[PDB]
Amino acid sequence: TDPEKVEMYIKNLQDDSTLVRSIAAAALGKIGDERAVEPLIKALKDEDSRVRAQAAGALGQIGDERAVEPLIKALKDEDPSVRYRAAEALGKIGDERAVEPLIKALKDEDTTVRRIAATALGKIGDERAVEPLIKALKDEDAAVRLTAARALGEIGDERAVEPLIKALKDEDAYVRRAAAQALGKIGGERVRAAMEKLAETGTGFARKVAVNYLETH
Amino acid sequence: MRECISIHVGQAGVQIGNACWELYCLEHGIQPDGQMPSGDDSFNTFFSETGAGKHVPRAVFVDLEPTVIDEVRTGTYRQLFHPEQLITGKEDAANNYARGHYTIGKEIIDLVLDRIRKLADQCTGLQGFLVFHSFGGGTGSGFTSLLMERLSVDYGKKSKLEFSIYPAPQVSTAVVEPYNSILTTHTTLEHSDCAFMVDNEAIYDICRRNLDIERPTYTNLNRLISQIVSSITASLRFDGALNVDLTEFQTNLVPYPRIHFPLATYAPVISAEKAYHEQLSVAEITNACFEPANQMVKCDPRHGKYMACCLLYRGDVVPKDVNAAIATIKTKRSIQFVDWCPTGFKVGINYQPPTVVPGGDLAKVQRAVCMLSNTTAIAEAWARLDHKFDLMYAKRAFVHWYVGEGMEEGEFSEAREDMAALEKDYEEVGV
Amino acid sequence: MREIVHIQAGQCGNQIGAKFWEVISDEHGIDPTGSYHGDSDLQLERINVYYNEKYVPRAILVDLEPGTMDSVRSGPFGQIFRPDNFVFGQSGAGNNWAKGHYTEGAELVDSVLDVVRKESESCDCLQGFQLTHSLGGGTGSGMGTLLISKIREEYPDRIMNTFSVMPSPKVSDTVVEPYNATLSVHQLVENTDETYCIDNEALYDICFRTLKLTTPTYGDLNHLVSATMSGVTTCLRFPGQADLRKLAVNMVPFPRLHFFMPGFAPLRALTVPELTQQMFDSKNMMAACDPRHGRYLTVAAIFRGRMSMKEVDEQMLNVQNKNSSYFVEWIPNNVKTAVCDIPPRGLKMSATFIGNSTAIQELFKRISEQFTAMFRRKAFLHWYTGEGMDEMEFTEAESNMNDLVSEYQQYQDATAD
Ligand SMILES: Nc1nc2c(ncn2[C@@H]2O[C@H](COP(=O)(O)OP(=O)(O)OP(=O)(O)O)[C@@H](O)[C@H]2O)c(=O)[nH]1
Ligand SMILES: Nc1nc2c(ncn2[C@@H]2O[C@H](COP(=O)(O)OP(=O)(O)OP(=O)(O)O)[C@@H](O)[C@H]2O)c(=O)[nH]1
Ligand SMILES: [Mg+2]
Ligand SMILES: [Mg+2]
């Protein structure tokens, strides 16, 4: 990396041009020097939301724990793009302090904030997220249900087994596939038993899934 | 709900809206009266619903002259829109920005806003505005910028995306269209979140090459524009696990102020007249997105650098096929990204394939893609327009028409200076 | 933008104005009693532009000479005009500009404005005004330019267009004509949007050199004027993609440079290439200027008849590449072409040309020379100055006309570089 550029970009975060500021925040994310962390934390309070969002994204890319509480605060932002970037960054950082504020983000009015918050929770892999992600499997948006099924497979808690079995009977073909994939990721005797009962009673895709699972275990 | 309000300004905007709304109706199984007889409720972001089950577009049509909207009022879609949504003046802007912005615009701005307020009051969570207009018309240019300014005051914290008609050098088209274009771009710049330009020369070339219409009409072009518009609005109107919604879409495509002019490319554009058409794969439709012949704006992206690149697929398209198609493009093409950017590709998939418009020129396809590129190559389109502006501006030709309609000459200089800065931005991001 | 109010002043104004109504009333399928007896629905589509509904012209007929009233009403289509719309005086101006502009003309003008007011009220959306007059006499010149200013005062946001006939020694042997022409040009430079320069010298030249009519009458000249007027207003009268203001915006780059060189072709049917070649030909221009002696700032072309649009677009592009030097490079896409399916009576195919060429300075130069010779000697000066006007007015009209010629030269010489 280049240290002369880092210090130039850090100074550009205080420039009067909203374009100069947002590109500077974006560039520090690409470089990823620890020296840019405090300047970017101050850039989360910038008047311009395009600068705020770029400051959030960069903090997730550098991934220093200092930015966890500043980003948690940014999840309460008026703008959904800042909220989205903050939620994503928090998943990349992977600090448990971010779990309860991200569980709140699963109930956001913005569907990209919900989607991204679920994958962030799956990335952190904390158990406190299992029951809220199970509730997120009943979301109006199939993309939010996709991320929740995927996040549950990543965590690997068996409280997700039976909710994922119902999610095989989902309207969306991809939520169904992601639920079967999550079940395989969880594994264990709890899913082999659920598959034994499904391969005998179930219909359609859900039965196909169960039958296939037994072919290997 | 994540509702969107559509504003159709001037002849180009209004006539594009007829094509858009004809398509949306067909895509969601809505009749021209608003009745729907045939399981997704996502289209409710674009249509309000009456207690009887009449679906009304969350759309407004504005023109400073009546003739174009009068055809909407007496046409096949007469019952579709509520009469209050269709607003007309008496005298137009006469291809003069200053008439649409100052003189004539000031007489209609407050009614339009109240009519938009009546639509906004019927929204549980208004997510944004889609504004349709020309650069070259006095209403398209002047009234759009005046409205964009007022929407920032009344709403501010709400998205505003544009679909603009970039002027072609055609014998009917006004002389002053390069002036109107630079003036509207200047005043809308800090008020828009994204602007999708459609260069009439490009659509005309596609209609001639792909649909083989020697003399394409506005109906030929608008039906093609509305296909691209549909692709961009599909995830707002349809449920699907593989969608990319508005804030993931905008945040990733247009993350920076000012430089929010993505180049749109659409594939496939097949003639309905073709006796046989081999169905094109994800690889083929993605490959066509890197062909300058399929571009919405005439420019060379192979000679520019990318900041963002979004692929919005629709139809029979599988995630793995998209990854495989992208992989081929990385090895074969010159897809140079700026050295301070993510270097990725945002991918969206909608399940519904394109809808065929009965009597239309397009053939039925299983898959389609609209690639949106935030490229420095768009500055080539800016330079062509800025040169045409410069030739006339040096001698200050036609300028008296503007200054006689509540505008000061300095507004032109200020406008051109902002274009210079916009062109330098694309240059600086390229180095 | 729908209705146009037409005004005709003086002898020339009323005679050329009457042939315009005779011609377009036949084109629109109206007989001398104002009854529509046509066949095409396209004839009545844009009828509300020049007519009020039986159809009556939105025409105001003015003269200080009471004799003109009988001349027009005894003409072929004389029974269509509104009887209340005839504003006639008790004595003609005797070619005195000051008599029409300040004395006898200023007395009758208020009565004229009453009629314009009444016709502008039964207008859904008034586009503007159109005046037919001569610059050589006293009434059409003096009173007509007074009327232009008086309408500009009441309707400042409406288009003001004129068909002004330029004096010529070849046609009228009246000495004071350069005074009347120079004093009017001074008014037209400030208060009109578009002036179509109908030069009596070019009208004579066409009759003499092309039509072989060596001793033409005014009826022969007026046949050329009626056909030009009919062709320049074709797009206003028939359905097409239009209005006075939009046209004016495309044709007028500089407020003062609004004087147009009109043309007509033809003067067995033609082909589109032969039509395009003839409508740009010097011999076919209605103003006595060499187009090769200037550059075109803007051009409006109107083709009438059943013809290929691919052919006209092709022929207008070649006429420009084969002659790039005669078109201004700093005004991109300055040549606009329009096609109308309805041709004029007697012709299978026709072309009307509207040119804003810097070569029109030749027309003004000719009038300036003629003015100068007279004014230095202060010849017949007291006829004017006696009626209440000042000598300074003559000095200002002279300065203005020479400045206009210098302005045309600057843009003719102006390069894109
Ligand atoms: N693609 C497309 N372009 C159009 C359409 N109508 C006009 N245009 C283009 O838009 C420009 C002309 O502007 P208009 O939209 O007609 O003007 P306006 O907004 O009505 O403004 P005024 O008429 O001056 O009040 C030219 O570049 C035309 O080629 C249309 O339906 N589709
Ligand atoms: N082409 C053409 N020129 C005409 C006609 N009648 C007169 N002129 C010309 O117009 C000038 C004379 O002006 P007139 O129209 O007779 O004058 P006026 O406006 O009636 O004013 P007064 O006679 O002073 O009341 C000369 O240049 C004539 O050659 C006509 O019918 N056609
Ligand atoms: Mg219009
Ligand atoms: Mg007379």
Numbering used by the authors:
A (entry chain C): 11 to 227
B (entry chain A): 1 to 38, 45 to 437
C (entry chain B): 1 to 44, 47 to 55, 60 to 247, 250 to 275, 284 to 360, 369 to 441
Reproduce the article's own wording on this structure.
Microtubules are hollow tubes made of parallel protofilaments formed by the head-to-tail assembly of αβ-tubulin heterodimers (tubulin). As a result, microtubules are polar structures, with a (−) end where α-tubulin subunits are exposed, and a faster growing (+) end, terminated by β-tubulin subunits. We present here the selection and characterization of αReps that target the tubulin α subunit. αReps are artificial proteins based on a consensus sequence of a HEAT-like repeated motif initially observed in thermophilic microorganisms (Guellouz et al., 2013, Urvoas et al., 2010). In this work, we have selected α-tubulin-specific αReps. These binders prevent tubulin self-association by targeting a surface that is involved in longitudinal interactions in tubulin assemblies, with different implications for the two microtubule ends.
The X-ray structure of tubulin-iE5 was determined by molecular replacement at a resolution of 2.6 Å. The structure confirmed the 1:1 tubulin:iE5 stoichiometry and there was one complex per asymmetric unit. In agreement with the selection strategy, the αRep binds to α-tubulin. It targets a mostly acidic surface that is involved in tubulin-tubulin longitudinal contacts within microtubules (Nogales et al., 1999). It interacts in particular with the α-tubulin T7 loop and the following H8 helix, and with the H10-S9 loop and the S9 β-strand (see (Löwe et al., 2001) and Figure S1 for tubulin secondary structure nomenclature and domain definition). The titration of tubulin by iE5 led to a dissociation constant (KD) of 270 ± 75 nM, whereas the same experiment with iiH5 led to a KD of 95 ± 15 nM. The different binding modes also result in an overall surface area buried upon complex formation of about 1650 Å2 in the case of tubulin-iiH5 vs about 2470 Å2 in the case of tubulin-iE5. Indeed, in the complex with iE5, a different conformation of the α-tubulin T7 loop, which interacts with this αRep, is observed. This structural variation propagates to the adjacent H7 and H8 helices, while remaining compatible with the binding to tubulin of, e.g., kinesin-1 and colchicine. Interestingly, although the α subunit in tubulin-iE5 is in a conformation intermediate between that seen in tubulin-iiH5 and the microtubular ones, this complex displays the largest tubulin curvature.
